[PDB]
Structure formats: C-alpha cells, structure tokens
C-alpha cells in the first residue's frame, strides 16, 4: 500500500508516490541532489532538513514531473514532497504527527501546502 | 432531476476534469472520487402591504 499525491505550478505538474522503504528519494528516476539547476539545491533540501533525515528512513518517495521551466519544476517537486509526507502521515500515521508537521511546515512557508495561484493573463482584443 | 433547483430552472468538452484543493489528496484513497468533479464547480413590484403585483 502507498499514497499518490500531485504537485502543481503554473504549467509544471508533478506526481509523487510515497510508500514503505529504507528512505530512498527519487525524482524522474534520479536522486534529489542532482537536478540540473544546482543553485536551488537547498530548495530540494528545504523540506527534509525542516523535518530531519532520520524520520524519512521509513518512507520511499518517487516524483515524476512534466511541464513548466526549471524553477517551476523545483517548486512543484518540493511542494509535492511536502504534501506527500503530510498525506502519508495523516492517512497511515496518527493525527498528532500530521498536525505538528503541518504547523511547522505552514509557519515556515505558505506555498509548501497550496501552490501560488498565479498564471499568465490572456490577451483579448 | 427531482431536486428543487433542477425543476425551477429558467428554461472533447466532456473530457474536462476538476480537482479540489483542506485535507491532502491521495489518489489511492478509495474516497478520492468524492473530490473530483466532471462539470464546472459553482422581477415584480412590491406594494405597500408587501404583496407582489403580477400582470
């Protein structure tokens, strides 16, 4: 058994699978630390270092992306990971852990649960 | 069909889907189908006594 979530952006859409495991992080068949724009690598390290790497050793996560640019894909990946962990610890783990994770993750940043509702406005005659 | 608002009505495209974002969404949850929508979400005069005038 496992949990599938989705992360959204302007045009970048990602899906995320979280299941039992030894703590493997995979994005597009690759680990999280070699996404091509290296400069936002701490963004890819924002969720896990917010929680602690020892806790993630029971969950294996795999994220696939399609659409958007580089940084939009990065934001979709990190938001999808955050919502994957909170959904996994809500459905499978007791409510107190989900509540404290949600509280710390909502006092850190707003976009890590609901993405920024921004899109390009169309041109009309 | 038998609802109140359906009777009182002023009387490709089908492949569109609508997600709703609350609790996080799990695709493998058996009750996720409640959170998806197949369609788009969302004159008379008054007298002194308060009675309407119909003509």
């Amino acid at each position: 058994q496992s949990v599938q979530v989705f992360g959204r952006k302007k045009t970048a859409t990602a899906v995320a699978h979280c299941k039992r495991g030894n703590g493997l992080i995979k994005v597009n068949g690759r680990p999280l630390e070699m996404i091509e724009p290296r400069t936002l690598q701490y963004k890819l390290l924002e969720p896990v270092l917010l929680l602690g790497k020892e806790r993630f050793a029971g969950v294996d996560i795999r994220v696939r992306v399609k659409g958007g640019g580089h940084v939009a894909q990065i934001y979709a990946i990190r938001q999808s990971i955050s919502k994957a962990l909170v959904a996994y610890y809500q459905k499978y783990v007791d409510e107190a852990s989900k509540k404290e994770i949600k509280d710390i993750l909502i006092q850190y940043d707003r976009t890590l649960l609901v993405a920024d509702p921004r899109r390009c406005e169309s041109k009309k005659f | 069909g038998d609802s109140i608002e359906e009777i009182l009505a002023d009387s490709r495209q089908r492949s569109r889907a609508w997600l709703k974002e609350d609790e996080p969404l799990n695709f493998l949850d058996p009750k996720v189908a409640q959170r998806v929508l197949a369609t788009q979400p969302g004159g008379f005069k008054v007298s002194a006594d308060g009675r309407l005038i119909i003509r």
């Binding site: 609901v114 | 609508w18 997600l19 974002e21 929508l37």
Partner: peptide, 25 residues
Amino acid sequence: PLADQILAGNAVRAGVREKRRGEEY
C-alpha cells in the same frame, strides 16, 4: 464658524477615495 474655517484652511483634506486597481480548484 470662524475657527472651523481657519482650521480647515490650516489642515489638509484626507479620507475617502476608492481606487479600483488590480484558490480551491
């Protein structure tokens, strides 16, 4: 009154002006 006129001339008008500028699914 006289003092009201003097103080209105001594102050600057302010207050109301509505400037009209500028998810779930």
